[PDB]
Amino acid sequence: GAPATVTEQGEDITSKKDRGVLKIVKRVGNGEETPMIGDKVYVHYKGKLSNGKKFDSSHDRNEPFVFSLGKGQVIKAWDIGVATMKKGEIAHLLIKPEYAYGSAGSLPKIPSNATLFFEIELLDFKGE
Numbered sequence: 001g002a003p004a005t006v007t008e009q010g011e012d013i014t015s016k017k018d019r020g021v022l023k024i025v026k027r028v029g030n031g032e033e034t035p036m037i038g039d040k041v042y043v044h045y046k047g048k049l050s051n052g053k054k055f056d057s058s059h060d061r062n063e064p065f066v067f068s069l070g071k072g073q074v075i076k077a078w079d080i081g082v083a084t085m086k087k088g089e090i091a092h093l094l095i096k097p098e099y100a101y102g103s104a105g106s107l108p109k110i111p112s113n114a115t116l117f118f119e120i121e122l123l124d125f126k127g128e
């Protein structure tokens with residue numbers, strides 16, 4: 001399924017080149033532009049553990065998820081991944097624990113040492 005495909009064909013977008021964050025572009029966005037550190041970013045996502053459990057979708061809160069890019073307001077993989085995205089892009093990310101919740105998890109929903117999968121859509125981004 002979608003997680004396996006990222007394993008097999010995803011691009012390694014980490015600095016350390018440790019396959020900690022793998023990416024496939026599922027829908028090509030607009031232009032060349034990607035967001036800057038500090039930009040307010042608006043996304044819709046669907047996420048799960050890579051084994052399918054704990055599924056969550058921003059769609060269910062009928063409101064985009066909003067954060068400031070590159071400020072540690074989200075897990076490392078999201079700071080790394082969303083920084084590569086164009087407006088309108090949808091990407092798949094497969095994420096090892098080192099770039100997510102590590103040994104502490106985010107209980108009770110996310111366990112220790114969890115690999116995560118997200119489908120992420122970058123709706124828009126704006127400087128504050």
Ligand SMILES: COc1ccc(CC[C@@H](OC(=O)[C@@H]2CCCCN2C(=O)[C@@H](c2cccs2)C2CCCCC2)c2cccc(OCC(=O)O)c2)cc1OC
Nearest residue numbers: 047048049054055056072073074075076078100101106109
């Ligand atoms: C482990 O490192 C970090 C961990 C957590 C954070 C905060 C968790 C952080 O979650 C995340 O980084 C990612 C990306 C954004 C979407 C939410 N999210 C998730 O993993 C969610 C997942 C869904 C399906 C599989 S994982 C997860 C859903 C369960 C609650 C934690 C968040 C978060 C930020 C802001 C708000 C929020 O919840 C709503 C609220 O609090 O009002 C949760 C920053 C971190 O790094 C600097």
